[PDB]
Amino acid sequence: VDVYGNPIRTQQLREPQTSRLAGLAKEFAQHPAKGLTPAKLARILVEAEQGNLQAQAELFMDMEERDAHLFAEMSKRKRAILGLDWAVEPPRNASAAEKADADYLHELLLDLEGLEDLLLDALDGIGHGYSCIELEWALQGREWMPLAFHHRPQSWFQLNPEDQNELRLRDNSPAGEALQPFGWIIHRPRARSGYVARSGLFRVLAWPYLFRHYATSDLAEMLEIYGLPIRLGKYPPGTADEEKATLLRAVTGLGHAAAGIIPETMAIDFQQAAQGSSDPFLAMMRQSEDAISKAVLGGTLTSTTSQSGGGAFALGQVHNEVRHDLLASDARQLAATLSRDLLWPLLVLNRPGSPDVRRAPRLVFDLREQADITSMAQSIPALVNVGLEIPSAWVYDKLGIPQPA
Amino acid sequence: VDVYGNPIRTQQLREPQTSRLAGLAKEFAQHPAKGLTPAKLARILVEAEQGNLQAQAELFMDMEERDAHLFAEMSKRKRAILGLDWAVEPPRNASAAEKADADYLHELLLDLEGLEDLLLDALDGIGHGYSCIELEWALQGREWMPLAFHHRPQSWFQLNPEDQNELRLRDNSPAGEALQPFGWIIHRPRARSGYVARSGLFRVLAWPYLFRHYATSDLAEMLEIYGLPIRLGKYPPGTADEEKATLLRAVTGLGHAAAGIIPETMAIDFQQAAQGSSDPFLAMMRQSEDAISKAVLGGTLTSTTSQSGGGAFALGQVHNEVRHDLLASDARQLAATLSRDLLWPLLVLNRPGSPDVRRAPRLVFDLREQADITSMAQSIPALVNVGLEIPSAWVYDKLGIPQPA
């Protein structure tokens, strides 16, 4: 059975759960981000907390699509994880059988195509708060294999009315449907303590995105209004409609027309419509950019060039440690969810026996940090000449040099 | 059969699929970018999401043509990949037969002309979200060969009404036509999780492009209006049409005419039409430039000179790591699509047997990063004198020095 203990029946693995819900596949996103206002966004968040995740997911998709800075930051964060080397390792002080099972799973994963896409789809849970991937199973003789990984939009799910922390499909029923065991991979990173609805990172970044959007739109309109000054023409009583239309045409053309003539009984005035500066909008956009960068990557230097020195070394150290521990946390969570959702079904479906869930293999990402080889090379001789016995295994491990074989 | 398992029939390889659709070849792009407004662009995106990819593809082509900064950034990104060395490597722990097949495919690819053009055409999927290249096959005796690679405009395809993730040709039918197996190379890089329509990078960059376009056009008009001030002439009652035309001519000429005379009963006033500055437009254009650079290359220094020091080292490290992992991701995706679409048909059509799809050869790009030879040279002697056995293979591999033969 799965790690959660739910009974597992192999009959349902032959067909995807969503196959019987063809209505979902034909849905088109409604794009709630267009014409968004603070009241509407607050309503969206409140209704999402009560189990209406569709609008929130669509809004998050639009938000990630429409913002270039948030796009770049999220892409950087995800590509940081995508570049890490991974391996499968048996349980602690494992035996020969457990070692063989771990090696077999490692072999299975190394050639498993689409793994990079699987990781990319799973990492969307950092922003959306949860990512669901459906597994398609097939039989190549006596062994079960995941034929393909299909990421499903977050708009397809909701919350259980009796459980705020449990996700369900949308099957036109108030209670939804429970997720099929051995049929989904669910990644739910925990940046904050709380329920699934409130756990998405995009919930924090929603407000700065709206601030930037409003500032940029207002700046664009103000750019549209500069240049020609607004001017108003006056006519005396007894002017006819033909002459008034002529005056309107003349006044409209005066902006691009260098000269014009009117009767002394008429008047036209110029007003300097805009008479403004863009500095407020720029400042607000910079504030939003800095907030988003700090929230996503934990720092701001990585996105913008620092125009100062002296403290650049301490800033670099802080940034490097923040990036390192953020990456470590994300990779550990991703490895945990992968080991929970993918490795266990393979182990229990392809290999004989019923191994304890306690001794199941765990996926591990390579979080080794490059060490300065020169410093170690110069330090070792003095220590060894003193008399200290430094194990060769530790030196190999820190330096990344593989053991002789 | 292909990697996707679809039955493959060699009869259809003799003619291109599009050959029977001569109407497509005669089509001319409609250039939707001219006279573009935010409402029109939003409509274009919305209709593209529903399966109307023609307008979106034409808009993306116009956008890449009309913007010099986006042009340069995309060219830099693609030429980064074009310069990487590549080789074909057999499956893991391969046998003699698999090694021979991989070597034969390597030989076939090395002399295969047009490979650089094939990579260039495939890399357009980064911006457009998908690039389709049609294969022309021929028989030189007993072996099949790709005679030529023909890139087709993205405006020729659409989405399956019953599948938002499946592409089809435009054959004047509502459902289109399914892509012929063994006849196309499809590259669909995945920057974000989502459907094919929303996966294009240009969708993110569309808005900053429009912002820059509007700012530059308004700045150009404002430049046109500076200089001569707008002036308005007045005449008293009883002025004749000849005299009014004369007054209009005089007022029009006063800008470039240093002097003029009019009756004391007439008046002319000067207004200082523009009385403005270009700073708002410059600031908006800089914002758009920075956004595009960050979205494309992950940084801004590579496109503009940094006017500060101190932190230049940390900024350079961040930029180098961002470029490295971005290039690695792009190259890995390109190699995956190439191995899926080009290597497998050659293996199954030119060589005997039916090798497992699991053991198929995979194209690999050279992602080795140059290591400082001096540091390694100075570090090795101390480590070896301590007693550590560092394999010569690892040193050769990191330093790029080939094995002795």
Numbering used by the authors:
A (entry chain A), B (entry chain A): 5 to 409
What does the paper say about this structure?
Bacteriophage Casadabanvirus JBD30, from the order Caudoviricetes, is a temperate phage that infects the bacterium Pseudomonas aeruginosa. The virion of bacteriophage JBD30 is composed of an icosahedral capsid, long flexible non-contractile tail, and a baseplate. Using its baseplate, JBD30 attaches to Pseudomonas aeruginosa via the bacterial type IV pilus, whose subsequent retraction brings the phage to the bacterial cell surface.
The JBD30 portal protein (gp32) has the same domain organization as portals of other dsDNA phages, such as T4, SPP1, and T7. It is composed of crown, wing, stem, and clip domains. The diameter of the portal channel at its narrowest is 30 Å in a virion and 21 Å in an empty JBD30 particle. The difference is caused by the conformational change of helices α12 from the wing domains and tunnel loops of the portal proteins.
